Amino acid sequence: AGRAALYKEVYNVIASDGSYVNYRHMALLVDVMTTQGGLTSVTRHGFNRSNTGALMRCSFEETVEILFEAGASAELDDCRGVSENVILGQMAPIGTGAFDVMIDEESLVKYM
């Protein structure tokens, strides 16, 4: 009921004028803001202090403090994140990156 009321509220605000955006975007925002069992504001700390990649979390202006925390806790960063793949310069598994392109000797044989 919390997320339903929240969706009602955000729809009310953004539909007071300049309506409308599609429903699914708003629903996605609500859900990612409520998918922790509790309300989680998108602040410098709210979503930022999740068990999420240190590089994207230091892309959000608490940089040296959160890097010190990461160094002290010595945790590992999975590099499945877009920001990690950008600052490491590899192509992110995104859109066209979301798969691999595999050769096929069998079809190559079959199509002489």
Partner: protein
């Protein structure tokens, strides 16, 4: 561990080849045709590698296969022949 892959049967992914691998396979085939790799269908004076790849897709002869990553790590495979190109 347990082979991290799947049999060709019970592949529970859509049979409709979608836009991102459309672009990717066109780009790759364009690059091989650019670097003097063997083409696999006849030509009609066209010299653009991308259009060559476009026709080569149009009658369905691409010597590539695709690998889709499920979120765990297990993966399906598909042959670009066995997809369908409608968008």
């Amino acid at each position: 561990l347990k082979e991290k892959a799947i049999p060709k049967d019970q592949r529970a992914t859509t049979p409709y080849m979608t836009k991102y691998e459309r672009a990717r396979i066109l780009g790759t085939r364009a690059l091989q045709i650019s670097m003097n790799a063997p083409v696999f269908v006849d030509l009609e004076g066209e010299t653009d590698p991308l259009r060559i790849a476009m026709k080569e897709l149009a009658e369905k002869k691409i010597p590539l296969v695709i690998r889709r990553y499920l979120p765990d790590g297990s993966f399906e495979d598909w042959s670009v022949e066995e997809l369908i190109v409608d968008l």
